[PDB]
Each structure stands twice: as structure tokens, then as C-alpha cells.
Amino acid sequence: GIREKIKLVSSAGTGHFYTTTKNKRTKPEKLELKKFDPVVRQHVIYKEAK
Amino acid sequence: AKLHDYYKDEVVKKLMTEFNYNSVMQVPRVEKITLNMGVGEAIADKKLLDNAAADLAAISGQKPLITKARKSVAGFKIRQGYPIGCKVTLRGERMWEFFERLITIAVPRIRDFRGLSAKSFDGRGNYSMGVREQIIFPEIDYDKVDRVRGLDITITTTAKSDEEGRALLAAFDFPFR
Amino acid sequence: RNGRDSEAKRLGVKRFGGESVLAGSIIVRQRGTKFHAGANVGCGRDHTLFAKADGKVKFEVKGPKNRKFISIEAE
Amino acid sequence: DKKSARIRRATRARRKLQELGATRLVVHRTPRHIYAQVIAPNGSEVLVAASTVEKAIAEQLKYTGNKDAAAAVGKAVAERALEKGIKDVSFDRSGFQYHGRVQALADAAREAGLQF
Amino acid sequence: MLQPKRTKFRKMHKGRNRGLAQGTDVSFGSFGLKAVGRGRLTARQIEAARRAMTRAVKRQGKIWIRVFPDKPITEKPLAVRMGKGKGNVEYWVALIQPGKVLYEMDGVPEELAREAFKLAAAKLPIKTTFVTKTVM
Amino acid sequence: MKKDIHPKYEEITASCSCGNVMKIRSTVGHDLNLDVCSKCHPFFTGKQRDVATGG
RNA sequence: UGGGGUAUCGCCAAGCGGUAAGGCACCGGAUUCUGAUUCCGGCAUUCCGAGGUUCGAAUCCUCGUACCCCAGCCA
RNA sequence: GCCUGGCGGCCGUAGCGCGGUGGUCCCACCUGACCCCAUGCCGAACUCAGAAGUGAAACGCCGUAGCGCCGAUGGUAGUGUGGGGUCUCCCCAUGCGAGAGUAGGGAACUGCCAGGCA
RNA sequence: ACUUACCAACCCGAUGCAAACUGCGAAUACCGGAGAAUGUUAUCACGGGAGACACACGGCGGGUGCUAACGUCCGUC
RNA sequence: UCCUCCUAAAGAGUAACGGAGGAGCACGAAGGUUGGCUAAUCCUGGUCGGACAUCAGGAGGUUAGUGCAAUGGCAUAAGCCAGCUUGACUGCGAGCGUGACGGCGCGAGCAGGUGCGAAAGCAGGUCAUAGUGAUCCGGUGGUUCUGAAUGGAAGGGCCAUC
RNA sequence: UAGUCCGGAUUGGAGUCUGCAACUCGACUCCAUGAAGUCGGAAUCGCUAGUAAUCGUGGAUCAGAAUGCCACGGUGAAUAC
């Protein structure tokens, strides 16, 4: 519905991204989640609420 | 602690004499005194409930707990979890100090004071009364009032019957018209 | 105004009492916890009860609420 | 009811430890005693028990029912449990907060060798 | 006419009418009009029979209608094909089995109870009989 | 009680016109002048003049 | 019979779920010899009836009523 | 042996209600709170330091069936197979056989450990 | 504040009804294990070739219909 | 098209223009964990305060609640509140369920790295069951795997994804 | 510069006088109360000089009852193309 799709990109040098959905209207703030990076193999901070 | 000591000698002794109790612990004691100020006009204004909270903070010696709505009802234009009153649960030493100020200097400063009603027991001894002004407490500055805000006191005690609460409260002389 | 129903989900008891199971085998695919998990039985995310060890299926009635457990006897 | 509220606080970890099948060290705090007993994985039979109502523990204490008494009990249960071949238990705090003298009892049981 | 004030679903399946009845003794009153045939009874037949009784034993006595309709019967209109939904709720019946005390009466002599129950059993579709209040 | 979220509740001394010097804890933070106390308030004389009307 | 629409002050007609807006009329004052015109003030419908959802219904849903419009065909 | 505490088996013949009793120990209420910790206010709860006082409440135990609960025997309902009729419903042979109700039972029984008394 | 042929919540006692009610609950069927006799492996897997996918009535359990139909739609034989 | 109940004959499945309702999402907390707590409604007393807003006590028992239908669940709570958080992880997966197939579902455990907890442990989204769309064609990021003489590149592949 | 030391209505209490008699239904006094009203919509009226405006005083009727009526004087305008 209204809830958009975003890419959580990795803070390490890799291009690896998780992908998910955000309500852009009610939460306009960016979304930072310490997720797992399998190219670095380490839990790195992910950014970019699209 | 003045009326707590007065309790521990003369009210315990007096009620052991009146009622023919066996245990010294079967005697009624006042558990707590809750001061509610259910403001309700804070559906539109927040500073009004903040001033109410400052007034219960002054009348007792504690921060009040701002209470929220349990159900939503449309009769009064409220909603679930909307903050609508504030209360202070006084117990322990501050219960006796507030009870001393209450029956000593706050109750006589009531306008047109005829007496407190004796039929204001809920069947289990627990008294509850209502003051119409916050001015009757000597702490509230008369020059700093904005809205007249009464409140309701509730003495909760460990008596089983309400005549037993007549006896307990009346042993502090607690006016009773 | 009517004329619709969902597809039948094929719930129920898949392995009955005394029936020998392997580990991992689903015993009761069900909807709440009509049957609860007992010894050597796990409860999945959709309340599917599955054999966590090998053995034999044991339907029992335990506890103060008369719940219907499903154990597995080691066999 | 205070006792019933405590038992329903206990129940989740109790049933979880009966589900895993681990020997549990059940504690029990009273306003003047602490009790500690090691119970088999079937839940019925005890193995080791020490407490402040035993005069072997109570005579060497100032007051049964404070943190020194509870540390004495934890040391006692760890000693007796190591004497009976029990090494690795799981701590059942039995509805109390792991804070005061149940923490003193369990820390004292961990210093004296009991593995949890 | 009798009809439940407020149902839970408007249309009921047919189902069958087997076995014997539950209301069997004359419970409230002293004389009873008990079913023998199976059948089912619309609300109009219950009302017709009750007016025959109430007229017959005049405004003395006391009459209990022990059955109640509560089962909606649907019919399709005329020149409507088969299919295209279930019909519409036309009336309401009670399902009767052999043994139902359909009516009770008290406060009259037995001979007026015979008379009113004859007068009213001729408004019902089932074979019917007269019973009395037996003591255990 | 918690820390400083509560108002300062210091013992003061109240005194009314009845000669009743009475020290109490109250969070006014100031000594107090009153008129009516529990001792010497017109409560019983008030009830008497209330009942004493008719004739 | 089905589908759609309407029901809001005495009349015609606006209303967005948290308040009922307009015109004509009516009421009071004034102008006038008097009436019409005019001018100054007012009032005013708890919204067709019943039930339900909602904290809250004119507003949303369902049913009934009353009046309109369209269809009710091929054989 | 009696009593109390803990952890279980069992899950109402075990629970409710009415009445009586217990505190040497145990337990509970209690005493105090500056500290460990805590309250969207409050040592009420949680927690800590204790032990003056009472078993009032609580809890345990003992009575009491007012109720809940268990519950036959018999009959009834239903029904598998075969057969029959007046066949939208029933009957026969045969196998299984309730629910409700009745007589009655009934205020539990028990294991491990620990402490107090004899 | 004073009277009352009227209605009536909740509670209690008694009486029925329910596909979308259940503090009870069969027969049967189904799944699993063991055992005997019988059966031309009747069973399963893999491979070659299909055909068929308009069904009908009759018993039993039902929906729809009017417990109407040589009606219609299922289950089972 | 998908979800729930009944029909549906006490395993599963089962039809009709049969009877009734819902979905085409929401949520970075409404997820994870740890610690705690327990409803509806009615009665009584009480300032404004009222049938119904807050307070206190009692009866009551989950008649409540569950982000949204219905059914089955739920007190050890799956309900309600707070602290810290990102397991709403990555690669796999014994074994099963379910479909003609395409597919869909449940999953203990193994490895790497993480959160909560003192610890046992729990966490691969949400009480569960709806919230959806094959292939082709093409877009974006990563990876020399390929790269029509050769070195690159273009294009293609593979992984992620629209 | 305030609904105020404006305004006095209204109302409670206490009285005096006249009069057979102040309840319906007088006048005045004292204490208390202290509304509305902050210059008046459409419209409308009077006045040309001792005038309008404003300030008091007297009388007739009358036992007592005028903010009316009829008189009397004090101060004293503006404006008329």
C-alpha cells in the first residue's frame, strides 16, 4: 500500500544491501540497523532508509 | 509522627477498650491516604493539568502520578490512555504528617464549615471526602491561584465494618457532624 | 452475496498413538495449541508439533487444566 | 496473594528446566531463613539440601536471613553437591528477584565450584 | 403469530425430524394436548388452535403453549427457476415428534379440557391425543 | 521516596491566634500565621447557633 | 420487482463524522395619513422513523416508510 | 509417631462455602530503611537490616455435605451388518451401546528432603 | 413528595429449540503395532501402450427444491 | 484470486448462481530478550462530575484483551507495562506435511557473527491461519565466470534486486 | 480613568408621619445590597436671545401622597450663506 521499499546499504566497503519497507510518511527519519555483512562477515551498521 | 504516637498509645488502647478484641493487631489502622484531583478539563489544555500537578505537589509533599483514561467514553470527549487526573498515594510517615495538617489546620479553614459527613463510608471503613477549594491548605498561595480546584481525599484503613472506621477516625476527633 | 470459501488446510493428527517416528516428523499440524508439546516434541511457529527425537508417539493428558500433551517415548 | 504471585512468577523457568531436564538448585528466601536444595531432573527426589534452619550452619552465623547467612548456605550446598558428584546444575531462583541474598547465595555457590 | 424476536442467522437448513420428543409430561398445567404424529406446525396453526382453546373454555383457565416455532422456512416465488440462491423466509414452524405436549391447560374441569382440545386439535396437521398430569 | 523530583518538605512552625504554637512538616518553606486551629474553632458553637433558629 | 436518487427550519434549497450556512417568509422597531416598497434588528430546523459501528452520527452501515428517475426484454 | 517448610506425583471423590483451632520451632503479618535495590507518586509492591508484638488477616490442620465433583445397575436414544414395512419414518435378527437421571460415594491420596516436639 | 388494573432487567425454580451452541458423547470409519488362516503378489516401484475426464439409477447421510420431479448438487456403497 | 466458519456423514478431502463473513495490509516497534503485572462489568463511598472521564474499597471471574474477519488458541500468558536492543541475521539443513505439477509449509541441528539474561537458555520476525502474481523482456549494484585473432571492452552468466 | 469614591435600580432589616386603617396599595428616613448603563440602530424632536441648555424655589389639587402641571428667578450659549 503506502509503505515504500528501501535498501539498507552496508557501512563497510561492500555493495551488500538488505531490503525492506518503510512508512515514509510517519517515519521520515533514516533507519540504521546493525545487520550482518556476509562479505566482511561481521555485524556492521546499515543505513539508507530510501 | 505526632498522631502516629497518639495512635500507638491512646487509639490502640481506646479501641481495645471499646470493642472487645483479643488480638492487639485486630485493631483498625489507617493503611494509606490517597489524594486525587481528577481534573478532566485537560482535554484541551496541558498546562492546566500541570498546574493541578503542582497543586497536589504542594498539598502533599510528593509528586503526583498523572493518571490516564482506562476506557474511552464519548460522553466526556476523551480517548483511551489520555491523561485526565493526578493522584498522590500518601503512606507511612507522610500519611501521619498530612493527616495531622488535615484534621488540625486544613479542615478548620474550610468555608462555612458545618462538619464532615459521617455517612461517607464505603461499607468497609474507608473514608472519602471532598474539598472544594485548594485555598484551604496553607501552602497554596492565594495570590497564585488561577483556577479553583478541589480534590478528594480517601483514607483507606484496615477496618472491616464502617462503624469500626467511625471509631478509628473519631478517636482522632476528626470532626464528624 | 455468498459463494466463497478458502482452500482446505489439511490440519489434524498426522501420526497417531504408538506410531513410530523419525526426528523432525510432524505429528499434529493444527491451529492453536489444541495439543501441547510434551517430552521430545517441539512446537513450531504455527503451532505445528513435531518430533524432536525418534521414538513412539504418546498422547497424554496432564496438568491442572487437563491439557492434551504429546510426548515421544525413546525407541 | 503474595505466595501465589511468587509461584506464578516461578512457573515459567520451572517448566522450562523440567523441559530441558537439568538438575536444578531451588532457592527459597524467607524473612529469616534461606533454603537451598538440589533436585534431580525428574523433579521428585532431592539430592543435596542446606539451609539456615540446620544448626550446623546456624551456629556459626550472627543472624539467619541476611546476605552473610545466604553466602554460608551457598557455600554449603556447593560443598555437599561436589561431595556427591554433582557438578553442573541450573539455578532456579524460584520466583525471587536475582538481586539480594539469592544473588549472594548463587555467587557463593559459583565461587565454591558449582557450575552454573 | 409466534416468531423469535431476533435470530442469529436468517435461513436454516432443512434437516430431518427423527426420533421421539423431549417435552413429554404435562409439566405446568393439569391437562395436555400431546402429539402422536410427527409433522411440523406453523405459527398460524399454533395461533389458530390457541384461539379455538381460549374461545372454548372462556377467559377462565390458564393455557400454556409448550412449543415455539423458531425454524424459518423459505420458499421460492412462482415462475422462478431453480438455483440462484436460497429462497425467502415465508413462515416459521416448530418441528414436532411423537410425544410433544403441544398445549397445557389448568383451572377447568376435565370435560372442558376435552372439549377445547378437540376443538383445537382440528386446526393442527398432526394426530393428537389428550393426556393428564401423571404423578411420577 | 526518590531523589529531588519531590518538593522540599521541611519542618516549619505554625502559630494561630488561639495561642496554639504547633511545629509541623509542610512544604511551604516559610513560617505560618493562622487564625483557626482545631483547638478553638467555632464548630460546636456553630452547630448550636445552626439548630437554635425557630420560634 | 430490480437499480439509482431524495427526505435538513413554515417553503425552496447548502452541509466535510467533533460546529447546522443562504434566500423567501414570520416576529419586533422605524419610514408613511394608512398599506405596499424600503431601512434596522431578531429568531430558526438536535436533521423521515428504528437498530447498529464509534469516545462521538445530520454525516457511516442496515432495515422500514414517503416521493422521483431508469429498466421490467427476445420470444 | 505428631506438626511445619520446600520440590514433585495427581488434577475437583482433590474445589468452594459455614464452624473450630495453631504458633517452642516453622510460616505469615510485623519493626525500621541512611545504605544493595525500588516506585511512570508512595519501602504498598520489590529489596535490605532486624525481632519487639500478634496469630487479627494469611496459611495449615480438624470438623460440617449447603453446593460444586465422581457415579453404578437397569432402561432409553443412537448405530455397524443382514432382512422387512404402511417406507420424508420406523420395525426385526444381531454386534456395539450412550447423554441425562436414580441409588450411592464424597469434604482427597501420596513420594523425596529438611527442621521442631515426644 | 403521594397513589397505581401496565410493562419489565438481573437472580432463582421449572420447560423446549439450534448447520454456523457444547461443561457430555457413541456406532462406524481412519491411522499405527502384533498374531493365525486364506488369496494365482492380490502390494509397491520403474518402464511401453492406452482409453477416459457427457455418466445413469437404487440404498444409506445430506445441501437445494415444496423432505416436488425419471429434478439438481455432493459423500459412500 | 486468497482467508474463516457451516454444509462435510467424529482422520484428510468433498459440490451447487448453498448459508455467513473478510483480505489485496499494518508495524523499526506492534519484532528479540529480560524483569514485572492481570481483565470486562456491576455495587458502595467520594470536589466540580453527569448514565458513563479520575480516586478508594468490594463482588466478579476472563463474560476482557489479542493492529484488522472468523475459527482454533492463550494465565507458564500468545494479553498489559518497563530496561536493553536488531535473530525482521548470512550459508546450510536430518526429517516431515502438502499439492498432477509449478509450487507452498514446518523444522531440531551444524558453521560464522550478534542481542538480551547472572545463568539455564531464548531469538532465522509478529498467537496462528489472508495481505497476492509464473515466465519472457528489461533497469540498478556486486562478482574477470565468459569475453568469437590477441589485450581490453560491449553483451551474456552468477549473486542481490526492481 | 477604574464599571471605579460613576450610576442608583432592586432587595433584606430597622423606623417616622398622616390617616378608623399603609397587606393588596403611601410618602419619607437610617443601615445593608449595589442591577442595567461606558452616549444609544433605522428613524425622530425642540429651540432665533435672557432663547436653547443647565441650576434651584414656590403654588393648585391635597389628611397624606409629584419625576406631572402651572409659575418664579440664577448662570447663560452656538448659529442663521
mmCIF file with all atom_site columns, N, CA, C and O (backbone and C1' of nucleotides) in Angstrom, chain B residues 72-75 77-78, chain G residues 18-19 54-57:
data_model
loop_
_atom_site.group_PDB
_atom_site.id
_atom_site.type_symbol
_atom_site.label_atom_id
_atom_site.label_alt_id
_atom_site.label_comp_id
_atom_site.label_asym_id
_atom_site.label_entity_id
_atom_site.label_seq_id
_atom_site.pdbx_PDB_ins_code
_atom_site.Cartn_x
_atom_site.Cartn_y
_atom_site.Cartn_z
_atom_site.occupancy
_atom_site.B_iso_or_equiv
_atom_site.pdbx_formal_charge
_atom_site.auth_seq_id
_atom_site.auth_comp_id
_atom_site.auth_asym_id
_atom_site.auth_atom_id
_atom_site.pdbx_PDB_model_num
ATOM 1  N N     . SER B 1 72 ? -12.151 4.494  26.785 1.00 0.00 ? 72 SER B N     1
ATOM 2  C CA    . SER B 1 72 ? -12.579 5.681  26.063 1.00 0.00 ? 72 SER B CA    1
ATOM 3  C C     . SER B 1 72 ? -14.088 5.783  26.178 1.00 0.00 ? 72 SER B C     1
ATOM 4  O O     . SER B 1 72 ? -14.798 4.784  25.940 1.00 0.00 ? 72 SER B O     1
ATOM 5  N N     . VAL B 1 73 ? -14.581 6.960  26.569 1.00 0.00 ? 73 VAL B N     1
ATOM 6  C CA    . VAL B 1 73 ? -16.024 7.225  26.559 1.00 0.00 ? 73 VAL B CA    1
ATOM 7  C C     . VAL B 1 73 ? -16.229 8.528  25.825 1.00 0.00 ? 73 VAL B C     1
ATOM 8  O O     . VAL B 1 73 ? -15.388 9.378  25.842 1.00 0.00 ? 73 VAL B O     1
ATOM 9  N N     . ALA B 1 74 ? -17.339 8.615  25.120 1.00 0.00 ? 74 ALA B N     1
ATOM 10 C CA    . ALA B 1 74 ? -17.611 9.751  24.239 1.00 0.00 ? 74 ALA B CA    1
ATOM 11 C C     . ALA B 1 74 ? -18.499 10.775 24.921 1.00 0.00 ? 74 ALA B C     1
ATOM 12 O O     . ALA B 1 74 ? -18.656 11.871 24.381 1.00 0.00 ? 74 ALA B O     1
ATOM 13 N N     . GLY B 1 75 ? -19.083 10.413 26.074 1.00 0.00 ? 75 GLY B N     1
ATOM 14 C CA    . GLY B 1 75 ? -19.886 11.309 26.888 1.00 0.00 ? 75 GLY B CA    1
ATOM 15 C C     . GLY B 1 75 ? -19.102 12.521 27.355 1.00 0.00 ? 75 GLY B C     1
ATOM 16 O O     . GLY B 1 75 ? -19.700 13.580 27.647 1.00 0.00 ? 75 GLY B O     1
ATOM 17 N N     . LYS B 1 77 ? -15.854 13.321 25.854 1.00 0.00 ? 77 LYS B N     1
ATOM 18 C CA    . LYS B 1 77 ? -14.875 13.632 24.812 1.00 0.00 ? 77 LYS B CA    1
ATOM 19 C C     . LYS B 1 77 ? -13.450 13.306 25.201 1.00 0.00 ? 77 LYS B C     1
ATOM 20 O O     . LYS B 1 77 ? -12.556 14.141 25.103 1.00 0.00 ? 77 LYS B O     1
ATOM 21 N N     . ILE B 1 78 ? -13.249 12.060 25.623 1.00 0.00 ? 78 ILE B N     1
ATOM 22 C CA    . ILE B 1 78 ? -11.916 11.563 25.968 1.00 0.00 ? 78 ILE B CA    1
ATOM 23 C C     . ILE B 1 78 ? -11.609 10.370 25.071 1.00 0.00 ? 78 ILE B C     1
ATOM 24 O O     . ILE B 1 78 ? -12.417 9.966  24.223 1.00 0.00 ? 78 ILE B O     1
ATOM 25 P P     . G   G 2 18 ? -16.611 16.412 12.375 1.00 0.00 ? 18 G   G P     1
ATOM 26 O "O5'" . G   G 2 18 ? -17.175 15.940 13.789 1.00 0.00 ? 18 G   G "O5'" 1
ATOM 27 C "C5'" . G   G 2 18 ? -18.471 16.384 14.255 1.00 0.00 ? 18 G   G "C5'" 1
ATOM 28 C "C4'" . G   G 2 18 ? -18.367 16.982 15.637 1.00 0.00 ? 18 G   G "C4'" 1
ATOM 29 C "C3'" . G   G 2 18 ? -17.837 18.407 15.725 1.00 0.00 ? 18 G   G "C3'" 1
ATOM 30 O "O3'" . G   G 2 18 ? -18.452 19.035 16.844 1.00 0.00 ? 18 G   G "O3'" 1
ATOM 31 C "C1'" . G   G 2 18 ? -16.327 16.937 16.804 1.00 0.00 ? 18 G   G "C1'" 1
ATOM 32 P P     . U   G 2 19 ? -20.063 19.200 16.919 1.00 0.00 ? 19 U   G P     1
ATOM 33 O "O5'" . U   G 2 19 ? -20.234 20.626 17.607 1.00 0.00 ? 19 U   G "O5'" 1
ATOM 34 C "C5'" . U   G 2 19 ? -21.318 21.483 17.239 1.00 0.00 ? 19 U   G "C5'" 1
ATOM 35 C "C4'" . U   G 2 19 ? -20.819 22.773 16.624 1.00 0.00 ? 19 U   G "C4'" 1
ATOM 36 C "C3'" . U   G 2 19 ? -21.852 23.535 15.819 1.00 0.00 ? 19 U   G "C3'" 1
ATOM 37 O "O3'" . U   G 2 19 ? -22.846 24.213 16.578 1.00 0.00 ? 19 U   G "O3'" 1
ATOM 38 C "C1'" . U   G 2 19 ? -19.835 23.490 14.596 1.00 0.00 ? 19 U   G "C1'" 1
ATOM 39 P P     . U   G 2 54 ? -18.064 -0.251 18.678 1.00 0.00 ? 54 U   G P     1
ATOM 40 O "O5'" . U   G 2 54 ? -17.523 1.240  18.510 1.00 0.00 ? 54 U   G "O5'" 1
ATOM 41 C "C5'" . U   G 2 54 ? -16.361 1.532  17.714 1.00 0.00 ? 54 U   G "C5'" 1
ATOM 42 C "C4'" . U   G 2 54 ? -16.283 3.015  17.428 1.00 0.00 ? 54 U   G "C4'" 1
ATOM 43 C "C3'" . U   G 2 54 ? -16.287 3.934  18.641 1.00 0.00 ? 54 U   G "C3'" 1
ATOM 44 O "O3'" . U   G 2 54 ? -15.019 3.999  19.275 1.00 0.00 ? 54 U   G "O3'" 1
ATOM 45 C "C1'" . U   G 2 54 ? -17.791 4.776  17.021 1.00 0.00 ? 54 U   G "C1'" 1
ATOM 46 P P     . C   G 2 55 ? -14.881 3.579  20.809 1.00 0.00 ? 55 C   G P     1
ATOM 47 O "O5'" . C   G 2 55 ? -15.903 4.546  21.552 1.00 0.00 ? 55 C   G "O5'" 1
ATOM 48 C "C5'" . C   G 2 55 ? -15.796 4.807  22.971 1.00 0.00 ? 55 C   G "C5'" 1
ATOM 49 C "C4'" . C   G 2 55 ? -16.093 6.259  23.248 1.00 0.00 ? 55 C   G "C4'" 1
ATOM 50 C "C3'" . C   G 2 55 ? -17.166 6.888  22.371 1.00 0.00 ? 55 C   G "C3'" 1
ATOM 51 O "O3'" . C   G 2 55 ? -18.476 6.606  22.870 1.00 0.00 ? 55 C   G "O3'" 1
ATOM 52 C "C1'" . C   G 2 55 ? -15.308 8.349  22.537 1.00 0.00 ? 55 C   G "C1'" 1
ATOM 53 P P     . G   G 2 56 ? -19.650 6.282  21.847 1.00 0.00 ? 56 G   G P     1
ATOM 54 O "O5'" . G   G 2 56 ? -19.812 7.632  21.002 1.00 0.00 ? 56 G   G "O5'" 1
ATOM 55 C "C5'" . G   G 2 56 ? -20.485 8.769  21.584 1.00 0.00 ? 56 G   G "C5'" 1
ATOM 56 C "C4'" . G   G 2 56 ? -20.239 10.022 20.769 1.00 0.00 ? 56 G   G "C4'" 1
ATOM 57 C "C3'" . G   G 2 56 ? -20.889 10.067 19.400 1.00 0.00 ? 56 G   G "C3'" 1
ATOM 58 O "O3'" . G   G 2 56 ? -22.275 10.402 19.493 1.00 0.00 ? 56 G   G "O3'" 1
ATOM 59 C "C1'" . G   G 2 56 ? -18.676 10.933 19.288 1.00 0.00 ? 56 G   G "C1'" 1
ATOM 60 P P     . A   G 2 57 ? -23.352 9.657  18.538 1.00 0.00 ? 57 A   G P     1
ATOM 61 O "O5'" . A   G 2 57 ? -22.992 10.246 17.104 1.00 0.00 ? 57 A   G "O5'" 1
ATOM 62 C "C5'" . A   G 2 57 ? -23.150 11.653 16.819 1.00 0.00 ? 57 A   G "C5'" 1
ATOM 63 C "C4'" . A   G 2 57 ? -23.707 11.879 15.437 1.00 0.00 ? 57 A   G "C4'" 1
ATOM 64 C "C3'" . A   G 2 57 ? -25.151 11.428 15.237 1.00 0.00 ? 57 A   G "C3'" 1
ATOM 65 O "O3'" . A   G 2 57 ? -25.823 12.314 14.351 1.00 0.00 ? 57 A   G "O3'" 1
ATOM 66 C "C1'" . A   G 2 57 ? -23.742 10.244 13.757 1.00 0.00 ? 57 A   G "C1'" 1
#
